[model samples]
Target: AYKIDGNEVIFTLWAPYQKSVKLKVLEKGLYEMERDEKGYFTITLNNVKVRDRYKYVLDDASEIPDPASRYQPEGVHGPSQIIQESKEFNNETFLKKEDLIIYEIHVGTFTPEGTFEGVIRKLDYLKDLGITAIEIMPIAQFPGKRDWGYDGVYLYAVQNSYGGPEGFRKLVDEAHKKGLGVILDVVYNHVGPEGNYMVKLGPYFSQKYKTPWGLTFNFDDAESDEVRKFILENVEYWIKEYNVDGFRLSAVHAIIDTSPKHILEEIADVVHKYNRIVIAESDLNDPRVVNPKEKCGYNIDAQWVDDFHHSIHAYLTGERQGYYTDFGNLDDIVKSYKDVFVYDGKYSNFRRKTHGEPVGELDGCNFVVYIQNHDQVGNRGKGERIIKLVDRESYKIAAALYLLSPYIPMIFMGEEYGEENPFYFFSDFSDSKLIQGVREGRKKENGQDTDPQDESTFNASKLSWKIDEEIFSFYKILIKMRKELSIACDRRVNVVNGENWLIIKGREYFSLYVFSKSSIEVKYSGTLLLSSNNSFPQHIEEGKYEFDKGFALYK
Candidate 1:
């Protein structure tokens, strides 16, 4: 909520530990700030204009950027700049929970320019690709120019390398004018190790709890009210200022909180007030995350269903490594299609525990399903897409199952055209020790062969956009069919697993798959709507069909 008036520019900071704070405006000298009973420091200068650079001097130590900085023009390790947020876009009536077909993208690699304006240049291409929403990977300020965005330190500032806050506002406004909603991926579990000043501000981190990345946030510890308020205010700032439709909260399972009103619930309450959606990425497979608050749940709108990807990837590619060891066979995928959780209180060989609970009476739309995403691809040892690892027929079959399913479907960038370029894990950490640590960690975890810090790693992850006509047609046609068919809307899917094929029946259509070496007969009755095989029969003859290692759709 940093606003600029006629002649004076008011500045504020929530530093409870500081008795005396100074505003260090570069080239404009320093000004003392007044402290209130709540420990908030404030100062109003007579002639501070937009784009002025400034930082806060705590007590007697070095200066730091505003915790709610709007623009970090000099990158994360430098001073923050003042700017007015844009209010030129309004998409209040344009988005709904059911109409969302998300296309996830990493802005730095989505195009050669790799900036927010570059993403806007490709919005028409995305619109023609049949996606209603764009889910951008994190754009918050991190240590360097290149990152996966999960390690953001300044939660409010846009990445300077990605064109800062003005560039992001332009992207969102352009997308809204084109009738596309924007969903931002935000990280709340842990802040990046470098260039983070929240620790000096107050008790923003908890020493009692630890996450896989680092120290957990002080959500339920001493002085937690200020911490919680800081986070919730950031969430509201994005909505009221940028007009973003929603956020995809990364790694909710790592947020350890024991407050009476959980942080997730608190966030949900604020975002829901503005009619914005909240999506969670939780590995716990807990249904309570999406359930109503009356049921003692977090009441989030949707959760990413990773089992959908695991089941399909394991069965089609036969890669039984890492977490993929927990999934295989047609039964596993069928379970995901029917129940949205394959390991529902069942033994998981990968984890050696009875994991997940039944998703009872929840709409299929409550689960976002995808065949490929950043994690599924980038986390691989070689960062290969499914098309690079499987036969063309298998890729088509998986596509058919994914797009035509009842759940909310999402696709990774360049997936529609079968781009072969890999999405690697790359970063630009200034610390040599941190770079070496990350390289060693990846090798120890997945036996990776490439150095994460090499500039080639980031350059190699860009999408080629070289279209494979056949694969592109396959994806576009299925999405068109999905939009046209009532069967794709029905939540009840009857899956019959055979020795070498599968038969999925719905209210208005049925899908048949044949995976045998020789042709196998399938019993069905309908007019053929589409098929991967060119030799599919035009009309069914009294419930009889045959195919080999491919799938067909009938209406």
Candidate 2:
């Protein structure tokens, strides 16, 4: 928001309760701002240039950044800098819902450089791997040098340690040139306590509700209009300025909004204008998350299907702790293929309640399924990827289950070539007590936990990039088959399952996925398109064909 007349720069801040507001600029040490009836403080500095840092002092004692500040060069506790406005993108590229093969990544751990520019270095590599889009974990400015980004406090500003806004723009700008869409993971439900000044500025959090992480956003409480406007504006800023294709809303179940116009619907409404997208990360298992607004739903384009991952993970790894207690049956795997949700209106032993609804009516693109993701790995005590937990042979089978499924698939970082290094949960905090408390909680949650604040802890999570030729070739071939085969996109899939095997039938092709020690006999006369077992034949025209613990794709 600017009125560039001559050499002057206009300033604005929102403090509805404050009787007076003062600005502390570099040239002007202390100055007053004229307040409007709607409680907007406005002032203009004639000699100020872009990149000049400033802060606002209100209620006589507190100094804070622009709640809507686009850049925080000196960190959250430091003054906010005036940045040159970025021009909107005209060369935006978008992948169709069916064509989207997402690869989720954390910027800090993506490369040793650990910056947005570092991510730019991997664009061609991602393209070569047949990735249509890369879903970046939240880049919103957080407490320190690195984090998982769910604890971000600054909504508009990019992480200062990740080369800030300019670095991210180049990543997105270049990714589009490579024909890969960029979907940023953002948290609108909660804000971390560290460096959060919005509580003093206005009613940013709801007194009526609280999030497990921390303060819940005031989306449905009194004076919520401005709070809602704040989020929608942030969405607009990322799209208009950084040129991101869309967002994946973090844990929407934590967003407590009772308003008639739900926040998710409003987000979908705003994003759809330019053919952009809104994807939800919710465990509610309800189809309504992606259902049309006319059907009393949010109309979001897609949502993460955790059941698909959890069910397969439990069955293969046999680690039935925490939420995995609700999984661990071969039937769950078959239901994931046929129903899309394993707990559709069924009792969850973990939650002790009925959960979910059928999603067959929704389009195949409405669900995003994956074998491994950040939460599934990093949330664990040892932060082990699926490849580490399951048998080496079963790992390839797991890849085939999801990559060739009807829903859109996402590959977690380093999941392609079976990178064995753990993706630990690590962070950096400025306060000593905060660091101590975080480590204690993590240790209690995960025995003998690595220090959450240590530089080594963060460093250990970076990708090994060690190539295992066999695993890499398997994933690449699976990805190619998913993209090239027309039958892979066909939604008319029939899933038949027994105690130890599953058969996925499309219009023109059918797959055999066996999970057993002993060979099981099945009939196949069609041409063999692909096979996980190296010994499988190109043309399997045999009755009572024997298969054991692998995937055989036939056409």
Candidate 3:
């Protein structure tokens, strides 16, 4: 913990093993730190101005960036800059959990400029697109200029290349002014390989635990209290400093902890203290993650419903590779529509085991459903979006299903107008060994045809902003209809599925989705509401009725 006292900056670092530490500033000379009884090094630097850069020097003659640095203006390996806390920003729109209609954006690829200010320029475009909240990819300091942000090492500092902390604050302030909230995507499971200084500071990484990424954090190991406090304080730091509405915790399943009360529960407790929402991204379809604490659960607000994405992607593309192997039937969509999990304690050939528990009486807002996201797109063999994989009619049907469902809906950056470019994996790691390692990893995941370090790869991922009017209008109309019909607000729904089709029946609304090769007939009678295909019949007949690719009605 650190605080500014009058004209002096008081820096405190908790290091158990270190016998001596020094505070190294850019302009000022090195100052020795005093050790307290609780293993914390305290130093008060007088006449330290705003934006002053500093680092901590250990007894082993290694100088490293602060683990609790506010801004890394020169990247993760560089010195940490002091923030001018006195400078204020105005949050015009105070958003709550339920008011979120999320639009996921990757700052580097969202625009040509690839900066936070670039996003601020597109506020009107997002506002017109009916977006209530923007869920941005991680902006913490990573190794270099470009990456997916999952490799961020500094949990507190903003990326130096992305205009740093002030730029981020301005973006948040402007977004609120445009009637939109900001949700940050955070990675806490593991740190990036490059420029990670937390290991030298204390017992931050565990020797026993492991993850898909390099090392697992020391969450429940020795000195775990400080580890938990470091992350928990980062949560409050974002809210109080940047005015972020909430967070999207990335890869919760990989965070292995055996504590009495799981770290996620503790994190949720801390985040809730500020009256903010916490959304989790997990592969485990356990309802306890989002269930209230009184019910012996973590009390998380919501989670990404990947089942909904898989069911639609598999149904449309018919590619059963990876996790899609478990989800390509009309029944999967029906199950996902009713309850957010399609494989709820059912047998699965993919994992070779029964996966996921059933979603109990949870609210619809606790599940965020989407047909596409960064993982579903960037992790592909060649990073192909849904628009490139499916036909026009099939894409319309997918849109109708996801937007018209009874859960909080989110769309990827370019999904609205059917963007054609692929969000390929790219990085700017300067180390030759690490670059080769990343390339090797991508080859193993995707194919050997891709190069993650190529400049053309990053340029290919940028949004072109080209409008396909017909497709664009389709999404706009669908989102408008979803909000106007108040589908997400309603809880109860009756779903009927066939061999190659499904029908979602709400209290006053109904939608018929046909994934078959040919048209099908159904029995229903209702007012003509909307249809995905122009050739399809809007009104239904009393007896057996034949319909086209897609149809919807108000009963």
Give TM per candidate: 0.97, 0.96, 0.96
Per-residue lDDT of 418-500 in model 2, one digit per residue for the tens?
89988888877787887888888888876537787888878889998898888888888888878767644457888767778
- Global CA lDDT computed for model 2: 0.83
Candidate 3 error regions (>4 Å)? 86-93, 489-491, 517-524, 551-555
lDDT of each: 0.85, 0.83, 0.83
TM-score of 1: 0.97
Q: Would you give me the overall lDDT of model 3?
A: 0.83
**lDDT of candidate 1 over 1-555, digit per residue (tens):** 256767787888888878888898999988888899877888878878888899888887689988788878887778899887554435353777777789999999999999998899999988888888999999889888888898788898989999888888889889988989999999888898778888887888989987778787889988888889878888888898788999999999988889888999999888888888889998989998889998888999899999999999999999899998998788889889898999888888889889999988888778888999999999886889998988988888988888888888898999999999999888888888888888998888856677778879889999998999888888888887787885433578788777778888887788877666444445567888888877778777554445668878988
403 Cα displacement, candidate 3 (Å): 0.8
Worst lDDT run of 10 residues, candidate 2, spans 517-526
By TM-score, is 1 or 3 better?
Answer: 1
User: Which numbered prediction scores highest in lDDT against the true structure?
Assistant: 1
Name every residue pair that clashes in candidate 1: none
The CA lDDT at 157 in model 2 is: 86
Query: C-alpha displacement of 213 in model 2, angstroms?
Result: 2.1
